[PDB]
Structures are given as structure tokens and as C-alpha cells.
Design an enzyme around this catalytic site. Structure first.
Site, mmCIF file in Angstrom:
data_model
loop_
_atom_site.group_PDB
_atom_site.id
_atom_site.type_symbol
_atom_site.label_atom_id
_atom_site.label_comp_id
_atom_site.label_asym_id
_atom_site.label_seq_id
_atom_site.Cartn_x
_atom_site.Cartn_y
_atom_site.Cartn_z
ATOM 1 N N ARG A 10 0.821 -1.218 0.000
ATOM 2 C CA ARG A 10 0.000 0.000 0.000
ATOM 3 C C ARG A 10 0.857 1.270 0.000
ATOM 4 O O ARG A 10 0.559 2.228 -0.719
ATOM 5 C CB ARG A 10 -0.953 0.019 1.200
ATOM 6 C CG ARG A 10 -1.788 1.309 1.302
ATOM 7 C CD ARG A 10 -2.811 1.260 2.458
ATOM 8 N NE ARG A 10 -2.180 1.014 3.755
ATOM 9 C CZ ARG A 10 -1.693 1.965 4.550
ATOM 10 N NH1 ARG A 10 -1.738 3.236 4.177
ATOM 11 N NH2 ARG A 10 -1.134 1.649 5.712
ATOM 12 N N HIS A 12 4.197 1.615 -0.816
ATOM 13 C CA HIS A 12 5.390 1.745 -1.654
ATOM 14 C C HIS A 12 5.296 1.252 -3.086
ATOM 15 O O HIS A 12 6.221 1.495 -3.871
ATOM 16 C CB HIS A 12 6.579 1.076 -0.958
ATOM 17 C CG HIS A 12 6.882 1.664 0.381
ATOM 18 N ND1 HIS A 12 7.215 2.993 0.548
ATOM 19 C CD2 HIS A 12 6.889 1.117 1.620
ATOM 20 C CE1 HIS A 12 7.418 3.235 1.829
ATOM 21 N NE2 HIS A 12 7.232 2.113 2.500
ATOM 22 N N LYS A 41 2.007 11.755 6.457
ATOM 23 C CA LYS A 41 3.239 10.989 6.561
ATOM 24 C C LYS A 41 4.297 11.874 5.921
ATOM 25 O O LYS A 41 4.110 12.342 4.806
ATOM 26 C CB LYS A 41 3.146 9.637 5.840
ATOM 27 C CG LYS A 41 4.398 8.770 6.091
ATOM 28 C CD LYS A 41 4.429 7.507 5.221
ATOM 29 C CE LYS A 41 5.650 6.654 5.584
ATOM 30 N NZ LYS A 41 5.692 5.372 4.827
ATOM 31 N N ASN A 44 7.763 9.515 1.951
ATOM 32 C CA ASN A 44 7.362 8.206 1.430
ATOM 33 C C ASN A 44 7.831 7.992 0.000
ATOM 34 O O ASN A 44 7.760 8.907 -0.825
ATOM 35 C CB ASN A 44 5.839 8.044 1.514
ATOM 36 C CG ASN A 44 5.388 6.628 1.194
ATOM 37 O OD1 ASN A 44 5.603 5.719 1.990
ATOM 38 N ND2 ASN A 44 4.756 6.440 0.038
ATOM 39 N N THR A 45 8.319 6.791 -0.298
ATOM 40 C CA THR A 45 8.809 6.485 -1.633
ATOM 41 C C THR A 45 7.895 5.463 -2.312
ATOM 42 O O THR A 45 7.499 4.469 -1.688
ATOM 43 C CB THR A 45 10.227 5.894 -1.562
ATOM 44 O OG1 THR A 45 11.085 6.822 -0.888
ATOM 45 C CG2 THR A 45 10.777 5.657 -2.956
ATOM 46 N N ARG A 85 7.851 14.062 -0.360
ATOM 47 C CA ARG A 85 8.165 14.702 0.922
ATOM 48 C C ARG A 85 7.306 15.926 1.168
ATOM 49 O O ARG A 85 7.016 16.690 0.243
ATOM 50 C CB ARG A 85 9.648 15.091 0.991
ATOM 51 C CG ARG A 85 10.561 13.909 1.217
ATOM 52 C CD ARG A 85 11.942 14.337 1.686
ATOM 53 N NE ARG A 85 12.776 13.174 1.947
ATOM 54 C CZ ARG A 85 13.392 12.939 3.098
ATOM 55 N NH1 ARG A 85 13.273 13.795 4.098
ATOM 56 N NH2 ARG A 85 14.127 11.843 3.247
ATOM 57 N N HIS A 119 9.392 -3.156 4.804
ATOM 58 C CA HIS A 119 9.815 -1.803 5.168
ATOM 59 C C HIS A 119 10.685 -1.240 4.053
ATOM 60 O O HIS A 119 11.529 -1.953 3.514
ATOM 61 C CB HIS A 119 10.595 -1.853 6.493
ATOM 62 C CG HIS A 119 11.488 -0.676 6.725
ATOM 63 N ND1 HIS A 119 11.012 0.570 7.088
ATOM 64 C CD2 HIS A 119 12.838 -0.554 6.672
ATOM 65 C CE1 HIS A 119 12.024 1.403 7.236
ATOM 66 N NE2 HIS A 119 13.147 0.746 6.990
ATOM 67 N N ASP A 121 13.676 1.094 3.359
ATOM 68 C CA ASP A 121 14.710 1.686 4.201
ATOM 69 C C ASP A 121 15.324 2.926 3.576
ATOM 70 O O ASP A 121 15.484 3.960 4.242
ATOM 71 C CB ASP A 121 15.805 0.666 4.531
ATOM 72 C CG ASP A 121 16.607 1.061 5.752
ATOM 73 O OD1 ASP A 121 15.979 1.390 6.792
ATOM 74 O OD2 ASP A 121 17.854 1.056 5.672
#
Length: 124
Positions: A10, A12, A41, A44-45, A85, A119, A121
Site C-alpha cells: 500500500r 510503496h 506521513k 514516502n517512496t 516529501r 519496510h 529503508d
């Protein structure tokens, strides 16, 4: 509750486009992927490769995660990604993002059976 694997997807995964479609991409995606619900948030990438290609990273280069964990993996190849961002004018609930397209290696933490990303990173 979401499974860790499903939360990664969801947050990434966006295989529907080869790259961010406009400067408004992050504003639209952060909202539609429910990352502006409880708050903005901050960072996020999104990865614009197939789910299979991203999952495959868990069998690629084993590296440390930024927090010292040993279950992180860096993609051997670069991937199309979009960094999102929060920008100066951003104020919850009116979240506002900068969209930056790039092509680089991704680093993800993997867990489970099947061993899949849980995750995001960093990117290099």
C-alpha cells in the site's frame, strides 16, 4: 490491522506507471494510499516496477538497515522510484508534497515466509 507485507504494498508499490505522471503525483498518491488520514506521513517512496521485481530484492544484496538490523537488501539494479516529501506549505489535514522522480537502487527490509518486503529503508 494490515499485515506488514500488505502495508508495504500500500505504501510503496505503484506498478501502474513507469514514472511519476506530474508534479501533482505525490499529492494524489499520498492521499489515495491513505497516508494523509491520521496525519501527513512526512516522507514516502513509491516504486514503479512490478511487484515481482520488488519482491525479488529480498533475494539480492544483503546489507545493514539504517538501524543496524541485518535483514535489509539492496537491489542489484536501479529502479524507477518517486520520492514524496512534505513541503513548507503543508499543514494537516491539508497535506502538501514535493514529487521527485529518480532511478536508483532500493533497500528494503524483508521478513516472513514467503520472504517479502516489509519496510522501505532507503534508496541509493
Amino acid at each position: 490491522k494490515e499485515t506488514a507485507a500488505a502495508k508495504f504494498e500500500r505504501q510503496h508499490m505503484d506498478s501502474s506507471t513507469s514514472a511519476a505522471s506530474s508534479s501533482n503525483y505525490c499529492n494524489q498518491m499520498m492521499k489515495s494510499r491513505n497516508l494523509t488520514k491520521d496525519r501527513c506521513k512526512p516522507v514516502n517512496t513509491f516504486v514503479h516496477e512490478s511487484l515481482a521485481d520488488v519482491q525479488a530484492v529480498c533475494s539480492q544484496k544483503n546489507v545493514a538497515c539504517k538501524n543496524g538490523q541485518t535483514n535489509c537488501y539492496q537491489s542489484y539494479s536501479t529502479m524507477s522510484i518517486t520520492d514524496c516529501r512534505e513541503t513548507g506549505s503543508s499543514k494537516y489535514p491539508n497535506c502538501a508534497y514535493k514529487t521527485t522522480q529518480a532511478n536508483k537502487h532500493i533497500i528494503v527490509a524483508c521478513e516472513g515466509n514467503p520472504y517479502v518486503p516489509v519496510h522501505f529503508d532507503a534508496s541509493v
